[PDB]
Amino acid sequence: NYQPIEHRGQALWLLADKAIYWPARRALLVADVHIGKAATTEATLARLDRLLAEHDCEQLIILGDFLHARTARAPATLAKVEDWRKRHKNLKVVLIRGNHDRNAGDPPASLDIQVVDEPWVLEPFALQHEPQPHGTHPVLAGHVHPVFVLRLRLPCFVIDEQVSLLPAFGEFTGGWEITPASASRLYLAGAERVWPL
Ligand SMILES: [Mn+2]
Ligand SMILES: [Mn+2]
């Protein structure tokens, strides 16, 4: 399931697997994948496989935090990421780098993906990892792992005119808690559904 919304003149599909499908651009957007981070690698790639099979995607765009830290990521993470990519040979991939990605020297060239530094404008949005305001464009960003507490922390889409937050696609603990008092539009991701609050 997904929740169709209209944002900055664009239809966007908030997906229950913590991702955004952008039909006009045939674009799948994810943030904070952390490939190779344990709760592993095979499971994160298989979820992407399913999203790619469910929607007509010509490109995948990663809003930073692609690979988990080399010294702590699951063995051979890099290898089957490479197999996965060339299994999706016709898919265009773009990593928008945050501080961790750029410091790590990610991605390796053998992955055959595109790499830019935040912000990268793709009209009408400035795409970023770090959720800081942009002077000319509305922002889609990640990095803080937004969650909402029910009673239970659930990943949360945060849709806002200035800076919108995608929930982390990959494993994480804690996360920046979005309070009920938020002025933004909130959508919870969990149990295969998206829940507008
Ligand atoms: Mn992250
Ligand atoms: Mn930070």
TrEMBL record:
CDD domains: MPP_PF1019
Calcineurin-like phosphoesterase domain: residues covered: 26-107
Residues holding Mn(2+) 2: 65, 99, 129, 143
Chain positions recorded as Mn(2+) 1 binding sites: 32, 34, 65, 145
Keyword set, alphabetical order: Metal-binding
Keyword Repeat annotated: no
SUPFAM superfamilies: Metallo-dependent phosphatases
NCBIfam families, per the entry: P_estr_lig_assc
Signal peptide per UniProt: none
Keyword check for Acetylation: no
Transmembrane segments: none
Superkingdom of the organism of origin: Bacteria
The name this protein goes by in its record: Calcineurin-like phosphoesterase domain-containing protein
Positions contributing to Mn(2+) 3 binding: 143
InterPro entries assigned to the protein according to its UniProt record, in alphabetical order: Calcineurin-like_PHP, Metallo-depent_PP-like, PdeM-like, Pesterase_MJ0037-like
